[PDB]
Amino acid sequence: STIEEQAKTFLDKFNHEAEDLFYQSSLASWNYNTNITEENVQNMNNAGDKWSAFLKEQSTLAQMYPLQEIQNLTVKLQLQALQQNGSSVLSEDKSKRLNTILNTMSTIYSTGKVCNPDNPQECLLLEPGLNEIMANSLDYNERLWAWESWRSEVGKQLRPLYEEYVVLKNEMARANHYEDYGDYWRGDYEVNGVDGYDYSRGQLIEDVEHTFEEIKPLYEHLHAYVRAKLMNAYPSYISPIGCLPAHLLGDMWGRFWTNLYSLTVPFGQKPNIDVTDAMVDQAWDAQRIFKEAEKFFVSVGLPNMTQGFWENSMLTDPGNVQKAVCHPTAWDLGKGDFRILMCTKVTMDDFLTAHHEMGHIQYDMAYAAQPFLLRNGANEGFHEAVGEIMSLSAATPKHLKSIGLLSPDFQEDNETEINFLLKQALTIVGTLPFTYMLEKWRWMVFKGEIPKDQWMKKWWEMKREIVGVVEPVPHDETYCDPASLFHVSNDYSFIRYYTRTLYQFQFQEALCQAAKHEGPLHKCDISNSTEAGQKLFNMLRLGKSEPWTLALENVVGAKNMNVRPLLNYFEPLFTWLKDQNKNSFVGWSTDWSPYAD
Amino acid sequence: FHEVFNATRFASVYAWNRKRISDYSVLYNFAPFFAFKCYGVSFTNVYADSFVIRGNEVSQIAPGQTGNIADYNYKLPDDFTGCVIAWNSNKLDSKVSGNYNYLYRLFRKSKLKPFERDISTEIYQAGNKPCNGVAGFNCYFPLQSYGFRPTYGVGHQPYRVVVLSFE
Ligand SMILES: *[C@@H]1O[C@H](CO)[C@@H](O[C@@H]2O[C@H](CO)[C@@H](O)[C@H](O)[C@H]2NC(C)=O)[C@H](O)[C@H]1NC(C)=O
Ligand SMILES: *[C@@H]1O[C@H](CO)[C@@H](O[C@@H]2O[C@H](CO)[C@@H](O)[C@H](O)[C@H]2NC(C)=O)[C@H](O)[C@H]1NC(C)=O
Ligand SMILES: *[C@@H]1O[C@H](CO)[C@@H](O[C@@H]2O[C@H](CO)[C@@H](O)[C@H](O)[C@H]2NC(C)=O)[C@H](O)[C@H]1NC(C)=O
Ligand SMILES: *[C@@H]1O[C@H](CO)[C@@H](O[C@@H]2O[C@H](CO)[C@@H](O)[C@H](O)[C@H]2NC(C)=O)[C@H](O)[C@H]1NC(C)=O
Ligand SMILES: *[C@@H]1O[C@H](CO)[C@@H](O[C@@H]2O[C@H](CO)[C@@H](O)[C@H](O)[C@H]2NC(C)=O)[C@H](O)[C@H]1NC(C)=O
Ligand SMILES: *[C@@H]1O[C@H](CO)[C@@H](O[C@@H]2O[C@H](CO)[C@@H](O)[C@H](O)[C@H]2NC(C)=O)[C@H](O)[C@H]1NC(C)=O
Ligand SMILES: *[C@@H]1O[C@H](CO)[C@@H](O)[C@H](O)[C@H]1NC(C)=O
């Protein structure tokens, strides 16, 4: 009767009704995605609109329970997740304008195209044809043209829209007592009222800037090695003491260096492990892969599959006419209905995507007993980390040689492991400075520390001094280079990709200690050990019912993200790089530019 | 027994049928019977109570259990001397687009005493101001429905339950 009994009584009814409506909407969306028909679009939109309407009604109904007299932490967590306004604190005018500019930016990014200077009737889009040039070409002039034109033709349409998107989002955040939009975004990692596991919104910035100063000694050696290797594919275009031109990095923005592996391979005469012929000669079909994945998952002590997972899932590309969206995902429809949607081939990368998606499914199966509103990872970076450690452990030669895809002897040498570690570092380490720098720029732009007449200037100085990458053409204040990225023009947060990379190696180093592993960390395999399975299930089964600082401690033993496991993972490559850079100049200077003469 | 075990339509949980009549080897010869437990034994009269509940709630039809079924819908005395059987009926009581004909009570002012039935449907008041027979804020409808469907995992599928009580 006090205030708490009424809250529990409200939350019961909400739980049941929301569960049912969400199942209906999710089944409609699955029916649309697995079998594309234009009546399925309406069948999905009806359920989506009715679910969103129910959600908004119950949200405006749950405001009448004051949060300052609820004493339970579960009830308070649910009520605080339900009471948030988000948008709709703005007028109808301003909300309409915000939705309009969001849709405009989305369609500008989706349907913008550039074309040739010598044939203006040859326009190419970004998706099929620009990031193919940026990925497969070795022509300096072609890469420079693509890089410059994408930014000068699409990047100039998004600046006047972004300049008011910033203001609208800022007042939307200030109306919810958040002091800016960046604080609203950081409000995901916040923990309150636990007296020992708390975590502030301004502490995330400090813990992100503190872990990055320990990665710099490895990123500098990787940068020096990559630069000394690029100085042989583009001679007279790279300076041996300067930064790297921004258009020579493998893709359009330099988010991943993984396409530079053909140029910077340590020992090109030792091929990497690739079990694809051994599968096709043994006639592995699209379901033996998933049987092996399920066997690996039950080997460590996790449950079997749901027995409804086999009939309702789509493990092969559909037939002649059932055109569907082929993108590997895991669906959690509710009421005990887990499915996987991927059009699998017989390859070695699908063999890893299987483990990734089934790790997602196991996570979703673990916390199926929590209330409806507490069914998610502890924060944004836990789900993909749990999915990634499985794909890490499932690709080691000790695993493939026991499954049967490798020869029973197969002596492995150190050159192959150097190749493997460099291929891993080109995509794991090469993306941390970029992510950190982009999110720092966005935080400072939303906070107001960068006036709107100094966006490009600050952007490129931060790119020079943090990432080590120089622009090939001067850019004035009529451009918008960040907005030419997907996550910026589509209003997505970018700090999850930073914390996930740290949680991943923390989890791996914590689970390899329970499986009694002795060698290097990049050879560890957690299969056939139930202690690792128990240690992981102790965390998977919590969901959002506990602060993330406690779920993280249940596995690792610490309360905040650490960066030592990543360096322990990359130690052999670090030693090799340090030995390879005896003559080069480790570091860069922030004054050289390709156009300075 | 072939009329309380073969009934084409079973009763809801909150209004459960209780059949009394004036060959045990026949029920023992049938479908797998997912659950079959009798605690007191291996009579003056026999009672047959029958209903349809969810899967993961079949664990509550037993003496000395708590939940939303052994509290407000069906309570068995701790001195039970009958035998409870339960079997899956997914292919009968489940339909696409939901089978909303099976209901249960999840709001009640007091727990049930053993072998008591309660079919009244007045509005439950959670706060302190009277409700006057109309839903709204802190006033709720006490009877909710199972949205039974065929694409449900076990434990969320319909299960037909029959309790045979002996004196
Ligand atoms: C994929 O969707 C299409 C369109 O909704 C389905 O086509 C019709 O489906 C209804 C529903 O059973 C049938 O009654 C019609 O005979 C179907 N017509 C045609 C021309 O196909 C199609 O059945 C769906 N795919 C599957 C596997 O159910
Ligand atoms: C309010 O908090 C209490 C404890 O602080 C919660 O009690 C737990 O309830 C679950 C399920 O009923 C039990 O499994 C736990 O053992 C209980 N905890 C303890 C310490 O006994 C209660 O669930 C909270 N309220 C709600 C609505 O969840
Ligand atoms: C959500 O928005 C509403 C208005 O858009 C805010 O205003 C309160 O709304 C409640 C519910 O109708 C009223 O009871 C209060 O009188 C309103 N004014 C207040 C609290 O000053 C509401 O505060 C917003 N909630 C949050 C969590 O931001
Ligand atoms: C996990 O352990 C099982 C059992 O110890 C291993 O399976 C056996 O492996 C040996 C050696 O390769 C074979 O001689 C047996 O025939 C296997 N038995 C079965 C039932 O498969 C399995 O190889 C181990 N897996 C890993 C990854 O270490
Ligand atoms: C891989 O291992 C081999 C064998 O240990 C290494 O070859 C030795 O390298 C050291 C380092 O200079 C030399 O002093 C030895 O003379 C080498 N062995 C022979 C037989 O000549 C090799 O250097 C290792 N490679 C890497 C990349 O670590
Ligand atoms: C429950 O009822 C069904 C049908 O109402 C019974 O199925 C019959 O089984 C006999 C035995 O072979 C057949 O000869 C009949 O043809 C079946 N009926 C139909 C309509 O096909 C079933 O045996 C009954 N079970 C019990 C335990 O009474
Ligand atoms: C999982 O299923 C396999 C058959 O698919 C069975 O042999 C095994 O015992 C099952 N394991 C568990 C824990 O249920």
Numbering used by the authors:
A (entry chain A): 19 to 615
B (entry chain E): 338 to 359, 364 to 383, 392 to 516
Report text from the authors:
Of particular note is the single difference among BA.2.75, BF.7, and XBB.1: the substitution of Phe486 in BA.2.75 with Val in BF.7 and Ser in XBB. Additionally, the salt bridge formed by Arg493 of BA.2 with Glu35 of ACE2 is replaced by Gln493 in BA.2.75, BF.7, and XBB.1, reminiscent of the wild-type configuration. Overall, these mutations remodel the interaction network into a highly convergent mode, despite the presence of diverse mutations within the different subvariants. The monomeric human ACE2-PD exhibited binding to the RBDs of BA.2, BA.5, BA.2.75, BF.7, and XBB.1 with binding affinity (KD) of 4.80 ± 0.01, 3.2 ± 0.03, 1.2 ± 0.01, 4.1 ± 0.02, and 16.2 ± 0.03 nM, respectively. These values displayed heterogeneity compared to the WT RBD (12.5 ± 0.04 nM). However, despite these mutations, we have identified a convergent binding pattern between RBD and ACE2 in the BA.2.75, BF.7, and XBB.1 subvariants, suggesting ACE2 mimic monoclonal antibodies might have the most broad-spectrum neutralizing potency.
The Omicron sub-lineages harbor multiple mutations in the S protein compared to the original strain (referred to as the WT strain), which mediates receptor recognition and facilitates membrane fusion with the host cells. Despite the extensive mutations, all these Omicron subvariants still utilize ACE2 as the host receptor. Binding of the receptor-binding domain (RBD) to the peptidase domain (PD) of ACE2 triggers conformational changes in the trimeric S protein, leading to exposure of the fusion peptide and facilitating membrane fusion with host cells. Hence, we characterized the ACE2-bound S protein structures derived from BF.7, BA.2.75, and XBB.1 subvariants.
